[model samples]
Target chain A: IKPFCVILPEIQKPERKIQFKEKVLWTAITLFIFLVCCQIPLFGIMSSDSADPFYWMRVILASNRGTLMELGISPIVTSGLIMQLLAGAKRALFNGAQKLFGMIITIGQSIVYVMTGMYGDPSEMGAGICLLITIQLFVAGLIVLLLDELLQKGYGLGSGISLFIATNICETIVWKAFSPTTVNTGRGMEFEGAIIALFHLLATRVRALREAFYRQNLPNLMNLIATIFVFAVVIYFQGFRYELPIRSTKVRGQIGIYPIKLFYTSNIPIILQSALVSNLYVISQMLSARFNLLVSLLGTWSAYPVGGLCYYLSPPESFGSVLEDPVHAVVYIVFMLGSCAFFSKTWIEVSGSSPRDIAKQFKDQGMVINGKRETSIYRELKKIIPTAAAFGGLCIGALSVLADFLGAIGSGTGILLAVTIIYQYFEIFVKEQSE
Target chain B: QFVEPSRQFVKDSIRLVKRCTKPDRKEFQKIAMATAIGFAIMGFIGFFVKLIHIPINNIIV
Candidate 1:
């Protein structure tokens, strides 16, 4: 641990267990504060004329353009990634170290984004104004960090980082489904939201209903249907589990089933995979613009990845695109499944959720498999845990591919994450009520 | 030798999937209802917040 890590103030756990109602209120308040910050535009930027480079990552990172949450959870996430890698490599570090690293990264990323003119040109924004914007971003990032800590320290429900991400994705899906905004297509003005467009078309131009259902350039009824389909599939998948019958050595005849869900590692693998892809995209984009031959091998870009490695990594936009370029689709599918499995296997080992860890926990709790000796607990768990994690990740990636092919709203990964997060919250609520 | 172990791994994964118990109707409905409620509650909270901010932000920007 770094000596300076203690400099970062930590949110101490509550002296007494917090009431469920109080926790819910705190969670809601934190969410409201975060949402408000997301809306507050960075002061002194004339205009954000530059195209959004992180558009694909915006929902995942919980970021908004030209707002106080411009960096969002990125600093926290990047710090977590770095610390996890370090810890996995045998470096001993605690939560305080991660917090300290996050603060530094927040400030560093803030300065880099401002200087790089992500919000607006430095000349247009003025030097003083740029500094002010950086300060605002850092402060907002610090607030986010504390809010997440507050929640994780037992003053609220799930971690604020996950809450923000799920909220952002769900917000996008809801807005795309029912937004009242209108835009002028080449032919005529139409409602932006799929549901709104459907209603408007039915009420006015009866013949345009088909067009509204399958609009190419906008959110359509088909996208909404696909989104709902993906949501249901993910929720159903969450219920798949193998329950291991176990008995307590401490209490005679006391027994229970320990469930190993099909999604053994949950959504961590996909989240890591997305983070890796998005970071690579950012780097490749920057390099491709500055250099030619060598950089072209990395990625060639126009509005989006037009060619090279990045093109293959990009998911097919719709079923039509998958048909148009089957090679890209195949490569993406293989990459998603392979990388997800790899990450899932690696994460369990690093995060202390491996068979060994579970075996140790069981031993400490005086629990053992129903028909197996206490000494053989590790052997039994070792047989199933890794396979579950790897295969679960594969299934998740396959589902994401299906969602992407169908043009699901909020993207497939977003729906997967949202379902899992919502399920976690439900479990929490159930446990709280029971208590 | 490597291929044999890899094939065994695949078989194990398949068996794991086969052995797992999926939710029945009552459990599925309960989970589905809870998830939908959570999603809707969070979605509406964020949507209304964004809706209220648009005009307020327009003036500020």
Candidate 2:
């Protein structure tokens, strides 16, 4: 298995540390390529009239339907989850195994999507065109995989997956705020973007300002305000931390504080939950149309989940939605909070961020907490880390639910993700500039 | 039996949340500024890319 991994394409790590300027250039170049791929239409796509199974998931996965980036980071994330679980079960040749698994999943996903007539039916699009489309998708997926590796290999500011997801989310928010596209919803033709509609309304029909702010069907001022509110809240919450004083054994008088952030596992819990629920949605939606008994038990979908398990699991769009379906709102909140905490706790163990790992790392660095014996470092961390992870996850989930209820521009999860990714980039910039 | 542990867990979580320090006004401003700048940069890049592709995709498809 390990030897087979060597045959797969891999990006070699840089021999020396890449300069800040070089890193920025590579990062920009990577982002540019990703954005370009996202825009490029797939060859021989006749119609994408089929209901998209992954519509809600697209923002987080950074996928664009009927484009070169149709698969996006889904294959990579899915492969990572699978490999991580396998590693946790036993563990070895981990990175190599993960890379191999990712490549295989990419090819497998391409085959499944093509065969399932996700692009267009084979009868209508032709077998040759379907084959061509599959090839194009595979090549694009491989490019995405390599680009992520390029960033992770220290040529870019952060991981490519995070960069792409954040970019996709930010792009949606900006486009919704300032898009020039116009649509007519029987109230006469109006700009689609919130800010654009605001200006347009202010110039022509002053009375329509109320309609513009509270438009249900289109991007509105309220959603924009909600987005900004969520951004500020997430940013504020990102700063919550408990600092523990530590003294260095190596340096006679060296002392510092180890901060245990409220978001101990950051946004990974939400990301994991999104991935899990989205996958479930895709499966349930796929089966709902054909299987009656199973559909009733799992979900019944039209454009969106209308009944069964999925209905309750999916977030309520607005306060009105919560009012209409109180059970759905309550179920969603409980599921989100519980699952996020669960994932957060599990992730720490799997990702080596557990108290045990931290204790070992601190001991290796010859640091001990003030007023605690070196032997008791693990015990000290054990008391605080799990609580932080669980509480932090619950808070993040609560914030997401709040944002959703208020009708945020992008989905609540997307705003949380974008804020965290931006903060990460901020940290990277600060570190580089200070150095 | 489950209720007891669950209640204890909730209590512990409340304590943890209370212990944590939140961002002050200065730090909040700095983070908000950085996020805004980052969002704009990425947004513009994506916007232009999509804008350019509108014409290109029209020709291709």
Candidate 3:
């Protein structure tokens, strides 16, 4: 085990379940702290006027420019990604591995981003000052890491990472619909919000309704329509769950039903997949720019991938993009499904969520499979657990791809993640209130 | 800071840590293979996205 794991804060999991109000307060406080950090820009760093290459993933990463959130949940997510991969291979051997890895990632990524001029030109600062800036970023990352642990450790209803991502994505969707900002394009100043721009065009244009509809509203309309469609689709899938009958040993004639949600594993598969892709993106982007040999193969010298290996991995941005290149879309979908299944299987194993574990828990707690098998609870669970996990993974994988194709406001995977998180919070809220 | 864990929590964490960190050589190979696969997957994605850039933009606007 790494020494850093020793220093990681221990969030004393509540002895008894917390009050719903307490959880809410903790969630809100952590969220507020995150927002405050996002607003606080780094000290003594020069802006290089470079656009974020991971713009599509900003919601998932919870990143913001020129602020402490520059690193966002990336360090945590990437660390989880690395650990997950190692665990899947059965190679990882450490307790608190995720946190240990997260700390290193935060430090390493801070240095990389700082050096790449994402934060600033290091040349502008003396050696000592540059080191200071790096330290500040690392400290900020550590703070975020702890806040996430605090939430996950029972101080909050859901994880801080999910809460932050959902907040960011929801903010983006709302801003897209309601923002009043106007930007100057080649066509002169235009409202940034598609709906607002459409309204302005309707008021000023002399064109026929059909012409205006095609020219002004279609693109924005597509985005809005896609966002709503994805929401409905995800909600529809959320309802596909079953309840297993069980008998309680504590009370005579006591009976209960255990729910096995179709999404047995939640949206973790997509989150892990995105984490892997984006980290590769950052690395490839940095390397392809500095090294000529990597440029054409991995990505363009700048932000976008041009051809070779990078092109195969980049997600199609919209439905139109997918239609434009069905081959790449097909390839991406296949790759996504494959990875989702792989990640899901490994996660179940690592988390001890296998049928054996579940069965053991049932046996220990004096709960039984309602006499389905007197021999053991494990046999009953073994029948359905693997199938359920694999099916859930494929469902999320496919849904994410669909969401991406439709140009969902937060991208497909982000929307799925946000929806799942919101649903988990709702369940917790209801359960707590009943008590 | 205001709360305390169940008495067995630290020992439990240590146990969990032990289960996770147990040594195995075959596991390392699998890990290496997965990493290599991930790299290849990432590289190809970048390539394909660029190859279809024209259609991607055409679909967007």
Candidate 4:
């Protein structure tokens, strides 16, 4: 028997492996060193006792909590919209604002913290530290973007999205380790499961590690066998889609396929919506901290400012409530629903489904969605849109309820991300080793 | 060949929202308008609050 009889090789060779590893490694090292050097000494000095006028500069890193070290929700998009609205309203102060410019600044800043949680809880730390990390991450995400752009445009590397998005793994891991996983939302029956699931999560890791590392006959011994089996079943269900043979009207250009995913949107719409919604939550928190009235009125919405919320944005039994009138859970529910809707709408707008482009692509190809002739394409689109929208809305609402109840978006996010990361890691490893 | 569909979808949705629900609508429209405004405000607030840059060791020195 050949030594490699059990393990199959990949069909193609990869030239980018070494370069990819090198790029990621250097980026990590550089980001880490820069973060440490920027904050360490400043925090060291800021905390030391100061008897003289130096006391003015002695705001320690821990005091300026709630204002920084958190991800801002949809800063660019919201701000751009806000600026345009303001411009329309003829607000003098904001009148000077260019919608795109404001959006760029907000997005630039947002991409920073969302990409890298370099500043450890700006709300917990003083103004100085939060500002430092915020600025650093902004510049870093931008630089990474620039590099990805260069690669895609010049060197012909894969989309830059994967590179910057990959950084999310580290930040997400750290966040899960420290913060509360659940949103402080409604009393969903799902919330109880979240608590039990959390404990199960910790146990699952132990079992998974042993099984993966030992390569042992320990699958039956692991507690997560159930979860794993369940996921396998779910994957079969989720991945099931009916594909009709696409007959093409045009030959050259088409983005159409007869194959339709029942969940055509995938988890991306969820991610996009969740990202935008959470960003809104962050922005609310920022407003509460600075604007005192809002600080009191919209306390529930402003999560990041208050140790970033436990379950339901209410004060933990320990911290006490944000105000005398904690907003009703229904109010927040309404808030959440609205966020979902906005995300759906905003996502739809940004993703323009151009028939012209589709036709162009399909003109050369042999397939189109159900052989959508130029005549009946409109009807097909109407059916597709409503179905997709309904599916997306339902899934997101369920996700929100479940994620909030489970109390650890971080853990769930961790699983979602870790699976992808480790999968890619092993995939690349297998591909290389098999070669 | 292009990921333009997702991008285009987002732009198109914003227009739909604007067209369907004006900021100031009478009675029933107000409900949607209210939801849109409040939804935008709440989420927008969350987004901005996350941006309130507390200068964590950000001094130029």
Compute DockQ for each candidate against the true complex.
0.81, 0.78, 0.02, 0.02
Indicate the worst ten consecutive residues by lDDT in candidate 1 chain A. A87-96
Give the Cα lDDT of each candidate. Answer: 0.86, 0.86, 0.68, 0.37
iRMS, model 3 (angstroms): 16.7
Segments of candidate 2 deviating more than 4 angstroms? A1-9, A85-100, A250-253, A317-320, B2-7
Error of 1 at A235 (Å): 0.8
- On TM-score, who's better, 2 or 3? 2
Q: Write the per-residue lDDT of candidate 3 for residues A342-387, one digit (tens) a residue.
A: 8887788768898878887887777877757645778767656665
Q: Compare candidates 1 and 4 on TM-score and give the better one.
A: 1
On the 0 to 100 scale, the lDDT of residue A394 in model 2 is: 88
lDDT of 4 by residue, A1-435 (tens): 233332322122234454555544544443332223223232212332312211111111111122221222223234446766765686322322332343356556544443333324335566665556556444433343334334343232233333223233333323322222233235222112222334444564565344333222211112233323322322332333434335655454434334333334344444554454444455554454335554455444421324323124321222123243355344445445454555554555455533333344444454455545655554554544444443444444444443333333232332232223323333343454566
Instruction: Give stretches of model 1 more than 4 Å off.
Output: A1-12, A82-97, A251-253, B1-6
TM-score of chain B of 1: 0.83
Local accuracy of candidate 1 as per-residue lDDT tens digits, B1-61: 7999889988999899888998999999999999989888888888899889988987866
lDDT of 1 by residue, A1-435 (tens): 467876776787799999999999999898888889998888877667887766666877989988899899887787878887886796233887887788889889888788764766778777798888888988888888899888888998998778999888888889888888889957776888888888888877646778888788889898898988888888898889989999999677777889988898888987888888888888887777655676887888887887888889998766777798989889999999999889999988978999999999999989999889999999988888999899889999988888988889988888888988898898899989999
Indicate the TM-score of model 1. 0.94
Order of quality (TM-score):
1, 2, 3, 4
